[PDB]
Structures are given as C-alpha cells and as structure tokens.
Design a protein around this ligand. Structure first.
Ligand SMILES: [K+]
Ligand SMILES: [K+]
Ligand SMILES: [K+]
Ligand SMILES: [K+]
Ligand SMILES: [K+]
Ligand SMILES: [K+]
Ligand SMILES: [K+]
Ligand SMILES: [K+]
Ligand SMILES: [K+]
Ligand SMILES: [K+]
Ligand SMILES: [K+]
Ligand SMILES: [K+]
Ligand SMILES: [K+]
Ligand SMILES: [K+]
Ligand SMILES: [Mg+2]
Ligand SMILES: [Mg+2]
Ligand SMILES: [Mg+2]
Ligand SMILES: [Mg+2]
Ligand SMILES: [Mg+2]
Ligand SMILES: [Mg+2]
Ligand SMILES: [Mg+2]
Ligand SMILES: [Mg+2]
Ligand SMILES: [Mg+2]
Ligand SMILES: [Mg+2]
Ligand SMILES: [Mg+2]
Ligand SMILES: [Mg+2]
Ligand SMILES: [Mg+2]
Ligand SMILES: [Mg+2]
Ligand SMILES: [Mg+2]
Ligand SMILES: [Mg+2]
Ligand SMILES: [Mg+2]
Ligand SMILES: [Mg+2]
Ligand SMILES: [Mg+2]
Ligand SMILES: [Mg+2]
Ligand SMILES: [Mg+2]
Ligand SMILES: [Mg+2]
Ligand SMILES: [Mg+2]
Ligand SMILES: [Mg+2]
Ligand SMILES: [Mg+2]
Ligand SMILES: [Mg+2]
Ligand SMILES: [Mg+2]
Ligand SMILES: [Mg+2]
Ligand SMILES: [Mg+2]
Ligand SMILES: [Mg+2]
Ligand SMILES: [Mg+2]
Ligand SMILES: [Mg+2]
Ligand SMILES: [Mg+2]
Ligand SMILES: [Mg+2]
Ligand SMILES: [Mg+2]
Ligand SMILES: [Mg+2]
Ligand SMILES: [Mg+2]
Ligand SMILES: [Mg+2]
Ligand SMILES: [Mg+2]
Ligand SMILES: [Mg+2]
Lengths: 135, 78, 116, 94, 58
RNA sequence: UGCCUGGCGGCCGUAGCGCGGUGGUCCCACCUGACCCCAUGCCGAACUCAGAAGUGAAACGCCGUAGCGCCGAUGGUAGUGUGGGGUCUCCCCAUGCGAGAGUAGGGAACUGCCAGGCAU
RNA sequence: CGCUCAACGGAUAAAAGGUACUCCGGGGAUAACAGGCUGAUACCGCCCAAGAGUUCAUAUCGACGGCGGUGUUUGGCACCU
RNA sequence: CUCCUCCUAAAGAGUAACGGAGGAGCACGAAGGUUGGCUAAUCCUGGUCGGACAUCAGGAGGUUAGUGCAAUGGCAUAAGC
RNA sequence: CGUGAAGAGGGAAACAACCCAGACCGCCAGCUAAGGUCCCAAAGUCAUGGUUAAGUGGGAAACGAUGUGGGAAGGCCCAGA
C-alpha cells in the first residue's frame, strides 16, 4: 500500500481532474498497461493489481509502477452533520487518459498480456496494452 | 468536535494604483507593496513601508533595468 | 579581489549621485598615478579631465604618485573646469578613503575654486 | 525504399489540424538546411502502417510533394495519447 | 464613403451586458431592425462581437 | 587612421563559466620600504604613506576553443474569450487569441565619451 | 495618566440558576413523527479468479480488488405540515 | 468572538463557510540616527589537549545563511555583520 | 452571468427559476423563433443515400457474445488453403 512517508499538509482540496496525461510512453520496460479512461486509483487498487500481475508472471522479469497515490482523501464518519474537514481515510492517484500505469520487462509478450489483463480486472478505469516504441 | 482553524487578517488593498502611461500629480501613490518588488526610479520615492510615490507631476513609466533585471517605476515629466 | 571590493564600496554613493543628477568629480588612484574626471550627470560624457599621465602635468613633478602630484592634478582639473564654467560638482572618491592623496586632490580643487 | 506522398497545407492551426485528423489525414512539418520549412498533410493509414517498421526511423525516407522528391529523416513523432494513431511528425531534410 | 446594412436576427433577452451595449452602439432596437452604417474597422469590430445575432448586407 | 591600455557609462548571460594560448616601451598589477599622515578588537594581511630594483608567476586584459550555462524558430499540442452542441465528474463544433516543454538552429558580445602609449 | 470595557464599535459603577405548576406573542424562517430529495451506510445482484475442495478455481465456498440494482436499515438535508 | 501572515480567491481591488494552516496582546536609548568598514550556510584537508561538533590554516561552495519573535513579500548599493 | 422574484405569450405531456421571446389597445390579415408536420392536434404518410429488427428508438455499469454495416492491413492458399 503506497502512501507518502510524510507530507507538508495533512488535507487537500478536492480539486478536479481535467486534461490528458503526462507520461504516455513505455519508458522503463518493454510492455505497459495504459489508462484509456479518467478517474482515481486508490492505493488498495494499485496494490491489488500489482499482486495479480506479479503472481501471473511467477515473480519473473521486472515490474514498474508509474503512478503513486499522493492525494489524501477525507471522509466524514457516519451520523455526523460542517464542523471542520473530515479525517484522512485513504490515498489516491489521479489518472487521465494516456497515463501508463505499470510496465513490465523480461517476459514474453503473451505472458505480459495475460498478466496485465488479470491486473486490469482489479481497476476501476478502462485500460489498454501498449508496447515500447523506438521514437 | 470543533476546529483549531478559523482565523485570518483583513485584506490590505495592496497593488498597483496607477498603471503605465497614467498622468499623476506629485505625491500620488503608484504601488503599495511589501518590500521592493518594484524599485524607485527617476522622480519616484520609496516610503517607509516601501510604497512608491511620485515626486513630480508626469506620466507613470515601468521598465526593467540593471544587471539583476529588476523592475523600476519612474515618472516622465510632461 | 581588491578592484571588485572597491567598486562595491563606491556603488552606493555613485547611485545616490546619479539619483541626485549631480555633476561628478571622479577620482582614480593607483600606486604610480592619480586621475580626475568631471563627468556630466548622464554619466557617459566627460567634460574636463586631468591626470599625472599627461606630459604637461608630469613634467613639473618629481614623482607622479604622491600628495604633491595629487594636489597638482586637483588644481589643474579645477582650473580647467572653471575655464569651462562649471563651478558646481560633487566629489566621487570611487571607494578610496577620503584621505591622503585623494584628500589632497580634493583640497586643491576646492582651493582652486570648485564648490563641493 | 520508403516513399510517402504528401500535399502542401493550405490552412494551419488548431481547427484546420483537427479537421485534417477527422478526415483521416494528419499534419507534418519538414525543416532543416537553408530552405524554408514546408507544412504538409499525410495519409494517416499509409503512414501509420509504414512507421510500424523500425527502419522508418533509421532510414532516409523520400517525400513526394508536388512531384518533387525530398530526402528526409523522421525526427520527432507526436502520437495520440491512447489510440494507435499519429498526430504529427517532424521531418528533417537529409 | 461605403456603407453596409446590418439587421438584428435574434432577441437581445438574456445576452451579456457587453453584447447589449454593442447592439446599442450599432443602433439596433428590435428583431428585424435594419440600420445603415459607415464601413470602418470599429463598426466591423462591433459586428464581430455580436455576429451570432446580426446579419450584414454588403 | 589603425593597434594597445586606463577611467566613466549604455546594455544585462548570443554578453556568463570552463579549457588552451598570449601581453609588460607605456598603462595595470603584483612589488620595495615604513620613523612618519593613517591603521590592525593581533598582524603595514587590509587600509595608508614614501617609492621603482624585480616579475608578468598570480590577478587583469586580449585571442582561440561548444564541454556547459545562455538564446531559439517553423509546425503541432495544452489552455481559453464569444456563440452552438453531446454520451455532461468531462468533452466536441464554428470563430478569435494561442502557450510551456521539446526540435532544427544560434551562440566564445556589441557600443558611446575622455585620457595615455606606439605605429603612422 | 487611569479599562483582558478580550462578548475586544466598548447596554450598568454594579448581576447566577429552576420551572414536569407553568404562561403570552410568534415560526413549518427551526428540531422531534410521517412524506420528499439523496443513497455514504444497509440489503440484494454481478465481474476478475488467489485459493479451499485427495487431483480439480468455477458441485459447493471464494481472498485481494472492480461494477451495479433496490429504496430497504443507520444516516445527511430542512423542501411540505 | 479583537489584531497579523499564507491558501481558498477564478493573473487589478475585494470576496463566504463550526473551510485548510500558523502567529500577536511585545521587545529595543540601542536592537534608533549617521559615517567608515565587512560578507553567509555547509562540507573537505592539515593541526596539542580536542572527540561527530570549540578555536587555527587552506580549499570547495555561492546565500543552500542572516533578519529580536509567525508567515508572506523583500534585502548585496545589502534591509544581514 | 442569466432568468424567477417583480414577467404574461410559444415550446419542453403536465413543469416559478430550462429553450424561444419581453404583452399600450383593437383585427375572423401576413412572415417567422424555439419546437414541429401519420391520427388525437396546426403543418411533408416530402425527396435522395444509408443504418437498425432490438418496439432498440421510448431508463443504467463493469463485463460477456460467430448479431449486423463500414475501413486499413496481416497469415495460409490450384506446388491444392
Ligand atoms: K560565451
Ligand atoms: K459585543
Ligand atoms: K428566571
Ligand atoms: K417536577
Ligand atoms: K444506489
Ligand atoms: K438511487
Ligand atoms: K446485477
Ligand atoms: K472439478
Ligand atoms: K407542526
Ligand atoms: K488572491
Ligand atoms: K546606530
Ligand atoms: K426580466
Ligand atoms: K419502445
Ligand atoms: K454466421
Ligand atoms: Mg481549478
Ligand atoms: Mg495535470
Ligand atoms: Mg492576507
Ligand atoms: Mg476552437
Ligand atoms: Mg434565452
Ligand atoms: Mg603593499
Ligand atoms: Mg600569467
Ligand atoms: Mg507556435
Ligand atoms: Mg515556445
Ligand atoms: Mg571567455
Ligand atoms: Mg463587537
Ligand atoms: Mg413530580
Ligand atoms: Mg403559545
Ligand atoms: Mg404560519
Ligand atoms: Mg422548511
Ligand atoms: Mg427517527
Ligand atoms: Mg424526517
Ligand atoms: Mg460463482
Ligand atoms: Mg469479497
Ligand atoms: Mg419508503
Ligand atoms: Mg429517511
Ligand atoms: Mg436553505
Ligand atoms: Mg407532508
Ligand atoms: Mg403538498
Ligand atoms: Mg486578487
Ligand atoms: Mg480576477
Ligand atoms: Mg459580494
Ligand atoms: Mg458575502
Ligand atoms: Mg472566513
Ligand atoms: Mg491563538
Ligand atoms: Mg554603511
Ligand atoms: Mg417578496
Ligand atoms: Mg414566462
Ligand atoms: Mg409557459
Ligand atoms: Mg418533460
Ligand atoms: Mg402547455
Ligand atoms: Mg409560413
Ligand atoms: Mg393535421
Ligand atoms: Mg416518404
Ligand atoms: Mg425502450
């Protein structure tokens, strides 16, 4: 479960999530899982997908996670009415279309495709399989 | 529960009062600022709170001058 | 660096003089020579000048790098300025202490007629 | 052996470029040397099939525009953020 | 010199204040009203500002 | 008229660093002494004074050189004023404005006043 | 010159409570019931398939996570009275 | 509950919430005026006691220091010593 | 910023606040806006080229599937795919 070791501030404005992603190329491995949709990825989701991927490849090759959950999300407890911002409960990464979420190397393409499909089944956002390009 | 926040200070109405090319009388405030984001040029004074004000009648002129690319305000005599 | 230190020393007074729009009497001192210039308020035009590297001044001096030479240069620059009809300047010690040769030059210029 | 047929662009900017890509072409630029840059339109399907070969980015290509042949090298490519499509290509005169 | 005809084609209800002011500067009073104006860059700019609700006869 | 040097400016990295070379007649610098004018919270290191044996070593100036800094299009992309639309958390169309980053490329500053030295 | 007049434009120099024994003028400008909007929570479906099941993921359960439906619990709001 | 600084605040000013974060209710006859002078942190190397860290010397570095006390805007011509 | 409030008329079945549009009075004249033209109910059972077979149109997601239309490539193939 990824989460910043420390932060300047405990709570963050909701903000919005417009635009296209930066970091749209396979930069470290040979294969990638890329977001086609827009949304939030919780640390639990990132880790559930990481587990699925890693077990699919039998801990062979190498795996990079290109996104990090650095945005804290607060909630108000049940049966509370104002009275200040709620408590931080989990952490998310904001995802825009085109964002490469994970990369893989050191395995055959068919196995990478299978592992990535198993991983995408854990995620709330539509994704697509990509490969490294020379330019 | 309750919050430990909830405080603020009154707005200080700083900023540029007379923009480039405006005709002003001597004494007119040109900019209110904390410290010297803008610096005093010809016919301009810098007060104790770093307010820049006209020392002569004329037209406001902004420029960038010197080795540090600093911003100066002067008054062109009209 | 000695030169950079002296330039830093001189900058505040020079900026004040420019802001005041004064006509400067700028002095430059070296171990061997002393120089004086009268500079217009724009800072880029020289009205009169005098130094110990001029033959007409250096030929009358035993040594060009002492208080007597400084006084001669001060008197000469003041006389040339008065001939041009200036009469009103501000002294610019250029980061040198107001002392010794620099002071002797200034005193000679004052005696010869420059008002500062 | 790579040959690409191109047209000179008669309209530039965001609206014209989006209309090109909606008509299944895409814009590109040729620059370098002492000649002025040339803004061209390319057929997306043909060029997208060609650039799948790794030699597209290492060989000396020939662009035929208005009959004249220009020798170029692919210099930069802007891809669609998530579709398998091309937005733009820089070509440098060889 | 040269003049152009400008007609208001849509209502002014609920338009931006700057747009209503531009219709005032063109002298247009109601849907279907046509006015004749000198052809100058300033007039052309006013037409450009409200081009969605006026039509020009050259 | 040209070359070299000093002072004061304009300008404020295309102008700054690095690396290599080079200059002492003059100028500049280091330099030589200090009882003295003056000075060290100790020290003539610095400041100051009196000088001119030595050296361009350092510093400085000049020349060369892209390893950097710096500058930098064209095209596309992002955003966006107004009007319209959709599957409306976000977008698209017409029109106008149009980056940032990156690419090609540029690039080892330019210049005014006064003074001095040399050649002429 | 004298005020933590700090409830800081400072009712007085000077001030705490109870009322289920209660009372008046008002408010659905504002709570408690029921309706409404919502659906976090609740409940019911589904997707992926780690595994359990001697072997065997899918007879039967389904971990880590994902997507919905209902209006159905605990709540939020304060729109009707 | 008054006052100050930042953000929210939509590149002039202003702008709400029992929104997100911190401070004040002083100090100083020098810590004020002016004239003259000066320039930081941190690290490396060598050096009695002396060590991770004292003072000394040189180098790198270039304000990463400093500012009577929050934070922001400033500050080398220093507003810092 | 716009409208309601304090604004009627036409449209959105019905629907202050949406879309069109600002009612001085009269007319058994005409042209338009939004929205519409088979009958209720005013106006095209209009023209041309396509798509859908679900009454989809006329309520919804991850996800599933030889539904069906279009386009650019690829593998094998009369030496028999
Ligand atoms: K350079
Ligand atoms: K009060
Ligand atoms: K009582
Ligand atoms: K009782
Ligand atoms: K629900
Ligand atoms: K619901
Ligand atoms: K279901
Ligand atoms: K089985
Ligand atoms: K009641
Ligand atoms: K602001
Ligand atoms: K003092
Ligand atoms: K109205
Ligand atoms: K139906
Ligand atoms: K079939
Ligand atoms: Mg925003
Ligand atoms: Mg972003
Ligand atoms: Mg403030
Ligand atoms: Mg546009
Ligand atoms: Mg309207
Ligand atoms: Mg000495
Ligand atoms: Mg040397
Ligand atoms: Mg451009
Ligand atoms: Mg640019
Ligand atoms: Mg150089
Ligand atoms: Mg009060
Ligand atoms: Mg009782
Ligand atoms: Mg009662
Ligand atoms: Mg009532
Ligand atoms: Mg109510
Ligand atoms: Mg209840
Ligand atoms: Mg209730
Ligand atoms: Mg099952
Ligand atoms: Mg479960
Ligand atoms: Mg119910
Ligand atoms: Mg309820
Ligand atoms: Mg309310
Ligand atoms: Mg009711
Ligand atoms: Mg009712
Ligand atoms: Mg503002
Ligand atoms: Mg604004
Ligand atoms: Mg207001
Ligand atoms: Mg208000
Ligand atoms: Mg507030
Ligand atoms: Mg407090
Ligand atoms: Mg001082
Ligand atoms: Mg009322
Ligand atoms: Mg109405
Ligand atoms: Mg109506
Ligand atoms: Mg309806
Ligand atoms: Mg009706
Ligand atoms: Mg009609
Ligand atoms: Mg009919
Ligand atoms: Mg028909
Ligand atoms: Mg239906």
């Amino acid at each position: 479960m990824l989460q910043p070791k420390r932060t300047k501030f405990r709570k963050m404005h909701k903000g919005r999530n417009r635009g296209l992603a930066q970091g749209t190329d396979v930069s470290f491995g040979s294969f990638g899982l890329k977001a086609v949709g827009r949304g939030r990825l919780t640390a639990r989701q990132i880790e559930a997908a990481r587990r699925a991927m890693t077990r699919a490849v039998k801990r062979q090759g190498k795996i990079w996670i290109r996104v990090f959950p650095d945005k804290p999300i607060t909630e108000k407890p049940l049966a509370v009415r104002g009275k200040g911002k709620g408590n931080v409960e989990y952490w998310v990464a904001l995802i825009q279309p085109g964002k490469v979420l994970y990369e893989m190397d050191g395995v055959p393409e068919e196995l990478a495709r299978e592992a990535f499909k198993l991983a995408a089944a854990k995620l709330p956002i539509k994704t697509t399989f990509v490969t490294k390009t020379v330019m | 529960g309750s919050t430990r926040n909830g405080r603020d200070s009154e707005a200080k109405r700083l900023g540029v009062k007379r923009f480039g090319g405006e005709s002003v009388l001597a004494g007119s405030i040109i900019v209110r600022q904390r410290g010297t984001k803008f610096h005093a040029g010809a016919n301009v004074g810098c007060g104790r709170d770093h307010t820049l004000f006209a020392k002569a009648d004329g037209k406001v002129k902004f420029e960038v001058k010197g080795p540090k690319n600093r911003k100066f305000i002067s008054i062109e005599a009209e | 660096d000695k030169k950079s230190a002296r330039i830093r020393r001189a900058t505040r007074a020079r900026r004040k003089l420019q802001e005041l729009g004064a006509t400067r009497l700028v002095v430059h001192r070296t171990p061997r020579h002393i120089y004086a210039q009268v500079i217009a308020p724009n800072g880029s035009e020289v009205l009169v000048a005098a130094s110990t590297v001029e033959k007409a001044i250096a030929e009358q001096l035993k040594y060009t790098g002492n208080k007597d030479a400084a006084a001669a240069v001060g008197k000469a620059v003041a006389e040339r300025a008065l001939e041009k009809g200036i009469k009103d300047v501000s002294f610019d010690r250029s980061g040198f202490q107001y002392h010794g040769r620099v002071q002797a030059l200034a005193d000679a210029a004052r005696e010869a007629g420059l008002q500062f | 052996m790579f040959t690409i047929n191109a047209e000179v662009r008669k309209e530039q900017g965001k609206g014209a470029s989006r209309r090109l890509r909606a008509a299944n072409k895409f814009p590109a630029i040729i620059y370098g040397g002492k000649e002025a840059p040339l803004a061209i339109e390319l057929d997306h399907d043909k060029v997208m099939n060609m650039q799948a070969k790794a030699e597209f980015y290492s060989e000396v290509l020939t662009i035929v525009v208005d009959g004249k042949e220009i020798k170029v090298k692919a210099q930069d490519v802007q891809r669609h953020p998530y579709k398998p499509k091309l937005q733009h290509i820089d070509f440098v005169r060889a | 010199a040269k003049t152009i005809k400008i007609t208001q084609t849509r209502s002014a209800i609920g338009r931006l204040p700057k747009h209503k002011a531009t219709l005032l500067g063109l002298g247009l009073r109601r849907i279907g009203h046509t006015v004749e104006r000198e052809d100058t860059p300033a007039i052309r700019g006013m037409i450009n500002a409200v081009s969605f609700m006026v039509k020009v006869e050259e």
